[PDB]
Design a protein around this ligand. Sequence first.
Ligand SMILES: O=c1[nH][nH]c(=O)c2cc(-[n+]3nc(/C=C/c4ccccc4)nn3-c3nc4ccccc4s3)ccc12
Ligand SMILES: O=c1[nH][nH]c(=O)c2cc(-[n+]3nc(/C=C/c4ccccc4)nn3-c3nc4ccccc4s3)ccc12
Ligand SMILES: N[C@@H](CCC(=O)N[C@@H](CS)C(=O)NCC(=O)O)C(=O)O
Ligand SMILES: N[C@@H](CCC(=O)N[C@@H](CS)C(=O)NCC(=O)O)C(=O)O
Ligand SMILES: [Mg+2]
Lengths: 198, 198
Amino acid sequence: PNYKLTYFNMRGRAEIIRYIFAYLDIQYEDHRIEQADWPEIKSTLPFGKIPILEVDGLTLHQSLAIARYLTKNTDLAGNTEMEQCHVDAIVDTLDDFMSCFPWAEKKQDVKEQMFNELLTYNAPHLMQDLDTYLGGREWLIGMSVTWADFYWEICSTTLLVFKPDLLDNHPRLVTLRKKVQAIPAVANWIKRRPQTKL
Amino acid sequence: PNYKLTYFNMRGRAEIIRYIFAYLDIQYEDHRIEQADWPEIKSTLPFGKIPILEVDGLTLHQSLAIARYLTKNTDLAGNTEMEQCHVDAIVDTLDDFMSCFPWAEKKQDVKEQMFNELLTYNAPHLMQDLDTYLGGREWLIGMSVTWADFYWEICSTTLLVFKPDLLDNHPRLVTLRKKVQAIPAVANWIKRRPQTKL
Ligand SMILES: O=c1[nH][nH]c(=O)c2cc(-[n+]3nc(/C=C/c4ccccc4)nn3-c3nc4ccccc4s3)ccc12
Ligand SMILES: O=c1[nH][nH]c(=O)c2cc(-[n+]3nc(/C=C/c4ccccc4)nn3-c3nc4ccccc4s3)ccc12
Ligand SMILES: N[C@@H](CCC(=O)N[C@@H](CS)C(=O)NCC(=O)O)C(=O)O
Ligand SMILES: N[C@@H](CCC(=O)N[C@@H](CS)C(=O)NCC(=O)O)C(=O)O
Ligand SMILES: [Mg+2]
């Protein structure tokens, strides 16, 4: 199939998709648009949002819906119907927290203030829940890597930018990040991808 | 399997699961708790959130992850992987919007302020996009009902409570709502379900 992923030049909400393509060794057009080119594109979209993934002429939207589609029938989806549910559940739990941040707030002072508050008063509870959930296991779900692990690594990479000590109390979550980063295909993408703040 | 759904005594985020169980004709325990029950309960939850679904003692969380789990391999899932992606996308677009509302904000007005903005400006645009997306088609995805249609009817029901004229200019979305409500198993549920504001 011919794939074309459209998003801004940043990891953001499209990174999970890029990790999946890398892991699966699938070629695709990583189309990164400049802010100025967004308006004319937005008007042609279903619900005016990106990322979107074009597959043989048809358009798909919603980052997680796309990610799930790409992992279907692969080892990244989950090893049992119930584990597949757990993968989806961990992914939404992580996405729910990421969606709490005022990424679009114009006023920098209020934005920064809210970021710091969420990272100091709210994040600790989620990190603990995740640590407890992971326990002494190697991966978040099952006994092999799933895209939920990829998502943890992607989300935490961004949160760590704003809160360096985020995982100082949870070395097990740090270990998981490193394990994902060590997967050859993932390590390679991480090394070659455009370096952007977000 | 023994199914036990735990949530507040309201439709909310659990209604989609309730609709699925009804449609598929699956018996389950519809456990509804009151606020005075939450505290002790929350302490016993993976990520302190409801709804949760217990399957033979095993706890599953995240409403959409659970909803997807129950509809896999059924006629509500989507007929192709691509269509399954569209179902997931439509559901997340709707969930994204519903999640924007400050349901928990404590101040009667600061809350009503964000609500007004969401209902007066954001809502109309989403309705337009959805209406355009549906076109003259019978259901949102494919040629048969899917849980995405279920979600549309559920989400729109709550939105209508705050903005009665939401669908005045989109009769096609109203027709879809009625189609879902006319499905025997669903109609029976809508008839017998506890009457709650949300
Ligand atoms: O409301 C917005 N308007 N315009 C935006 O560009 C924008 C960006 C935005 N961002 N989201 C994210 C990542 C989200 C995420 C969610 C789940 C998992 C992983 C990631 N990043 N991000 C932005 N970053 C930057 C950096 C520099 C300058 C501007 C931006 S936006 C959210 C909302 C909006
Ligand atoms: O912060 C909260 N804590 N506990 C809660 O139970 C809770 C519920 C809540 N609410 N969510 C919804 C509906 C969500 C929805 C999402 C997708 C599709 C359709 C629906 N309603 N809701 C509440 N409603 C009321 C009404 C009166 C008094 C209190 C509440 S909570 C939001 C936050 C929380
Ligand atoms: N939940 C959606 C979020 C879609 C979304 O809001 N995308 C933002 C960028 S991360 C966007 O399109 N912003 C431009 C706009 O809203 O005009 C997903 O994961 O795809
Ligand atoms: N995205 C989650 C939302 C989970 C959530 O926030 N649930 C609320 C009820 S609507 C809750 O448990 N609130 C109590 C709390 O957060 O302490 C889902 O759909 O399951
Ligand atoms: Mg979501």
